[PDB]
Nucleic acid binder design. Sequence first.
DNA 1: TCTAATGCGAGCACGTGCTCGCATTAGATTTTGTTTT
Lengths: 1154, 801
Amino acid sequence: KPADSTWTDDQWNAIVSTGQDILVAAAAGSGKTAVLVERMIRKITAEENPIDVDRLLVVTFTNASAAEMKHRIAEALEKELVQRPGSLHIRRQLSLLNRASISTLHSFCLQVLKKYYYLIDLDPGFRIADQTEGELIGDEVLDELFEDEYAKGEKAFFELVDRYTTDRHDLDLQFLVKQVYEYSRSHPNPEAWLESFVHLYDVSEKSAIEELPFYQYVKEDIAMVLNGAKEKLLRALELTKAPGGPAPRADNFLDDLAQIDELIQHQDDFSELYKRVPAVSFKRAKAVKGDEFDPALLDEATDLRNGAKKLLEKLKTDYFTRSPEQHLKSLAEMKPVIETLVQLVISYGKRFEAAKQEKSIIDFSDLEHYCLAILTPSEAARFYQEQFHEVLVDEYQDTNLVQESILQLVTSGPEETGNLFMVGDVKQSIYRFRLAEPLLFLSKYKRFTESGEGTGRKIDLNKNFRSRADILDSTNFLFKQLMGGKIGEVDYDEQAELKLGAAYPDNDETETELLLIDNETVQFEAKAIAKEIRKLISSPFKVYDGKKKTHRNIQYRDIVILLRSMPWAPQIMEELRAQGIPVYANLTSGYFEAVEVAVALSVLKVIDNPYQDIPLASVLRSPIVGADENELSLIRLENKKAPYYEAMKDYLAAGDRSDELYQKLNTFYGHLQKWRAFSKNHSVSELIWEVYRDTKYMDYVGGMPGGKQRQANLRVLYDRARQYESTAFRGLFRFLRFIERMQERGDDLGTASEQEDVVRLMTIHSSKGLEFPVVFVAGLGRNFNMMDLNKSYLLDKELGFGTKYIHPQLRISYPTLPLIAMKKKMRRELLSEELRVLYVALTRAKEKLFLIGSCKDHQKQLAKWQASASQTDWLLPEFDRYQARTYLDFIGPALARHRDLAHADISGHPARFAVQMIHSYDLLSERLEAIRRGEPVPGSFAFDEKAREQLSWTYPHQEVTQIRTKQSVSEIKRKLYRRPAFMMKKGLTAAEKGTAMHTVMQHIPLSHVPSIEEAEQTVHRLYEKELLTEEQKDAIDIEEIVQFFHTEIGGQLIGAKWKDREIPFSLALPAKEIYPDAEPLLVQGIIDCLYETEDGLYLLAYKSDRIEEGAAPILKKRYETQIQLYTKAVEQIAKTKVKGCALYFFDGGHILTL
Amino acid sequence: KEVFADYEIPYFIDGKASMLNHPLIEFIRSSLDVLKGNWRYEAVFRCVKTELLFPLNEPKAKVREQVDQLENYCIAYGIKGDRWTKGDRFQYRRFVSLDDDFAQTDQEIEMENMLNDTRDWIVPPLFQLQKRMKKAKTVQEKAEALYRYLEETDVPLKLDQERQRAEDDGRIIEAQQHQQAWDAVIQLLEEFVEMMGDDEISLDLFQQMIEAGAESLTFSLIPPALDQVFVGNMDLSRMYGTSCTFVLGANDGVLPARPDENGVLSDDDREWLKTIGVELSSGGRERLLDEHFLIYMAFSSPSDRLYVSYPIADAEGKTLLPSMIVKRLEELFPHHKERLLTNEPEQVSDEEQLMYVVNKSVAQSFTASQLRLWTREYDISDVWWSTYNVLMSEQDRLQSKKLFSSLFFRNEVKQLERSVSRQLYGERIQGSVSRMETFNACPFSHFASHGLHLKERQFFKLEAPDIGQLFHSSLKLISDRLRDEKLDWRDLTKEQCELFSYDAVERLAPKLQKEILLSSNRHYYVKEKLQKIVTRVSGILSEHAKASGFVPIGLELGFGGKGPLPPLTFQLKNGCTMELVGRIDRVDKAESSKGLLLRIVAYKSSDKGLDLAEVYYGLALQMLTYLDLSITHSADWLGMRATPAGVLYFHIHDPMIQSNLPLGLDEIEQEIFKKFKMKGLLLGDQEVVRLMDTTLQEGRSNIINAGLKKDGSLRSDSAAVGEKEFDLLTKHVRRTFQEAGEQITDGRVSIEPYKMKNKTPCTYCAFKSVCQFDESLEENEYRPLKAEKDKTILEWIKKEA
DNA sequence: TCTAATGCGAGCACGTGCTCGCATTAGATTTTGTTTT
Ligand code: SF4
């Protein structure tokens, strides 16, 4: 249904369209979130036939997006509720939203695991392990597997080891195993993908090179460089037509070109190229003598021709130094080694899963794979299909194959009539190293149509509502000449270009700036950045608030520096902090190089094992103790051969208390011993906190340069210890081992101020989804990371595993053809990703842009840029874009044709640029001493009285904060490690028999004196009522039961007005009556018997004490306080009075009165 | 717990503590881990450090100090498994070199005895436990074996002593939990044998169930007192007469809390079962809707004041969102101020900053931060100045003064007093080139090395220096056997090289790093790798011998100490004599027209050659020192005054050539041979070059880094220099040693690391936690060394002359 | 770990001059990071 309400037609399509799988290509700045929300709201808040929220499935990249989704949906539900308050449905959706399925894919998979744990071999109470924890488990099973393989000693294994290890150790092999396994985990069937490795090496001499898969990349590479050698020579030929250009040398060029064209004719024939390419030679350059020429152009043409020479020689050394038959033979010889490798990796996988199951543990990879195992479509899958009416997926361009196989599985119906709704943008796919596939998005882009006729719908959102025209124009201009072909993987045309949709009052300083620095380079860089920032702050720059239409002077909050990498961040932070610019940046590593963390860890180490000289010396020299070098050496002087700890003990054993160094070491020693005993009974976290308060080290570092950070570094160590308590539970032993093992393999943790007026320095990758008025992108004059394409082996999504030809005995190695193919492929893929990184970089802004890079010589590099910018067509030469290794190599030539820095439309594009050729030379107390002395500062402060009142204050009722409320009679009077039941003899103990008689006494009829028969009858009934255990019933004396009722007190018990037994009481006693100094505490108990006669109220209690005159005075005091507590209870609560108490003893039938 | 303890607030937590930290439970669990994992290092010392294995009525502080040194020993020697249960004594020797063999010092015997005593009281109870456990089949006898293990070690008595100590210190609640722990364990065993006493069970499943039961163990709830702050939940916790109620964690997902459905029955299951007629527990949507009633009961409980708080960030730094309740309260009470809770007082009013100072500890904590903030040009509130004055007005002020000493803290290093340095280093510094280089790189690193003699924890792991020693001693052995059988390196065949090298490594293996190469199959293969390396090196040395005019004089020739050559001696201002002993790797002599020629060759594991910049800064002084001594003593030791032929590095390795051309076996052999082309420095003349490579007629050399033209003169690519440069370099080395030794005796121990070519010595140093170097902290900076070209260096050495 | 400057001789073009072809060392430079409870 069509309607109008501030949406665009495309956005409208993305909201209302239903019936098939829909792909929404949301550009940067497009209201993808708002559209997604509105689309959901309509389904949730419809009038005709609404659906519940829990019938949907929203998959996000980060939890931030899911939470934001939840809140915006909530706000919309609130608005709807304002318009229709009465509706039960709309109200109910707000309650359901907390239980809604708005999660990440990992979280959803977790839900599936928790629900269908029984389908696969999984524990219902499984725990998702730490990355370090799992990797330590992996390391262990690797060592065990390797040890087992060495033990078997198979030839194939040694053959593998000898090839993929150094001459001294076998680490590199185990790293290879880990890598292959991880890379295999990114396929919905890891084992099959691993077993497809051998198909690449299953060749012979009779095999056609041009028919094999990997050759697809070998082909284009040749077609590229040859076409790169032709053009490079055509430009030389054109340079012969120039007036100052050399005319005779064109003959040589006309020869060389003819040779290259000859090669281009046979590009599809690899066998022919082997015969032709190595035979190509460039004739001696015909020297041009005369002053009618031009030395610059003369020497330039030679450079171009030598460029063709370089390219050709590179092509020959890449492919044509051995025959295609020899290539095939080499590739065929490597097959068994590949088979061994695969089986080894598979073994590691099975061992790793078994190990993880042993501890009820899964990975993040297991989170996807176990979920997928569950869904396979199985009953679970059909249930989830039934439940979800639609599945929404955000950032679809970063979805991997396993995630996709889960999405396609949980969605109901084929692609033509599916419910899978997905939104994203390939141009912003910057996560390929995490093995995500943007081709998954692009394939569905081409597969779909703009209509929904018998296929999936594609919808393109072009309008950018959040950024200025200058930004969009600059971006479109640059990436029109950069993205496309094999370097962009996507054609940069209309319907892909950014379109203006933001209403902006024009400013004159919004033009994109480029700052090129001549000649740390980062020093000059950051200084130039600082100057521009300072100029932007000093002279009022107005930032426009699009929502409220008001200009505000720019804050430090609105300025962000974006970097490709973070090693440059510290220096930039230091320089900007020096310039007076507030800077914040988050670090994902460098936590264990912080001095405070090193010292605190050293303390934990000494507490674990004091006989470690280095952590000890660390603690001693640290502010914790404060020993200086003279004092430390003094400690060593006492004992030179023994450990440093022994030397410390010896100094303590020989030193006098009048020494300051003695006080240091002694106080530390007492502290140390306390910690030793403390660590054994408490957790690690508790030990850390106790250390922190006993040393005040956290308080100390809080008062030194950068203490804000330092205290946080010490805080997260406590929090990390608490985190570890789940992994393998508590203990300094376990904790320190875990940290040590984490560092020894090279793993790290973050150093983990979001308030205004701070300049954020962060990675371009992290800036994804964020937006700022002013964006600085530096390091543009710095090389990309091509370290991936150097090793003897390589891993690919399609081709699988490539590797050099390695012969251990002959000590020879040389690259195999599929390896080189993979290198070319991975390079241009990497370059594509980098180009997309530059894209999100430039699109993260709203007002102004700042491009900054460095170089060696300005003019020569400008000519280098002009060399690439000679073509009339929009798109820059694909080979020149391929040869790029620096971000400048992308920006420069694209900017060379522009009017500011080459006819036709390219000059007239509405993009504006400002270029600055910067050079390196152009960038070039009373209170204090009072505190140092320990003396107070002089002055009258308003809070002096308050502070001194509060520091002296003591809680009025402190003496009763520790006093137990509930007490017991035995405990008041007061104011054995038993053996197992199956180790002792058969029952019958003192307490058993005593209680067994007590039960009879409290259950025996008090109507009249019973005989032996009546007593035995009562006992028998208590035996049948299960009031008495059979062992309690078997062992009983019958005499004392008779003896009591023959007594005086017994006779008075039988004859009484009123009787009661086992009367539970709670008594409130003033605190003073039990405690010496300075509010009722409770005292509970059970009075055995009470009876009332015409004389008064009498108390009775039974005791099974050992007796058989002299025992009576002892028994009197043994239960004195007890009886007094009983009498106090009756007299205070019942408000009556007790006249006389009586205690009966079974052992003999004695009675004493109190 | 920790915050209220620190803020002196008495509390009552309606929750039962876990026993998983109690020494008794850990003792049991880690014991079963010893039995299951076959006596792993971790399980064994987890078992020991619970102190329940400690000898009865022995000083805990002494027993611990014994266990520790046993631990360090177990770590360095990789003791595990049956080695614990073997009859063999743990043999100890503080220092062993594979070039000789001594006898045990009385000290080492004393130490070894102590170690074996410690082992002898640790093993038996743990051993006997493994005996019965293997033999026990049913559950009852396994639990019986476990309990016997508890009683034999006198655990009840040790727990009783511990709780008595706890009572004595006043920790009565801590004292009670011991008896609680024992009762818990005994009850667990009883229930176990009650349900499956006669059932035969495996050790793994027994441990699994013991572990499972131990995880459930809870200490009895600490009884409520007369005056406590009641901290509890919002589901089962009950209250009465509450005046003030604090509501915590008003975050989304937390309040209302999303109910985890999981069990045997799902929400759809229970829902359908509800429609059938079966009424079970509530569902997810039901318990989610009950949340409002719970929030209602919590909000309506306080009589006087209600506080609703929420954190915006988690422990790591992840953003936490406010609840729907916060917004609801913002609706019901639209003009109610939101109060900010922060540990950064400068973000709240002075009246709120005044609430911080509640006692001495927290006041000191905050005011130290406030003082640092004050040093950063901030007008901090006067309340902290008031509290500061109070903290310096009462008795305990030195503690506060010490805390506030951080305000002016820098990583300063006090120079060692003359008396202290003289006593520490000694009257005579008997050192080496390595020590002098260590000082030159960083003075403080030298102070911690050859001063404090701090030793890093020794591990049962094969490192690079150990392997280097293996190579050195191997070549030494081969050389000796060569002179024994009247053989020369020229006369060595492939078979002979292989057998010689293999046997040499075989001889050195059982004395290399606590016999690590014999400890596993993996290290066995490492041994074979090393044998292959020594083999190929032997072959290269053979080929080199057949193409060189230089004959090796003394291999591993030591100067000073017991060596044939006398030590180089230095005199200092302090009066302390400084002599350097060392071991020259190899010295070669050769006759020529210039007279006698001497060159020094050192076996390196790296290929990189001598850097004149590194020599200038005294970082590479080995070779030139060796050459200086060899030349200066060439008369009294050998024959006549000789001439420096040069210094050479030999790369010991087994290379893999990466050729892009189909090579033949001979071409491959040549490409391998070319990888051993020695780097270093040479004498700038044709005769010497021809003496080091007699094969070289014209072109480049495959043995030495030099070449020849048609004339006979060496090309500019040759790493050679005149005799002037050599003598100049040696004099520079001597001056470096003199100055270094001078600064050492003066007591200079400052932290001064260098940074040349983006390289720092700090990366290879283990004293990083001792020096506590902080670049951000001023007065602490690297020493930028300009990596100049050789000619610039030599020009500097000339201008210094 | 691959990329750029250096040394010197050989042969090809206009006996001498100059460009190429080879072989090497130094040499400079240098990551990205969600995800659960
Ligand atoms: S680490 Fe760097 S600074 Fe600290 S001592 Fe070793 S060398 Fe000197």
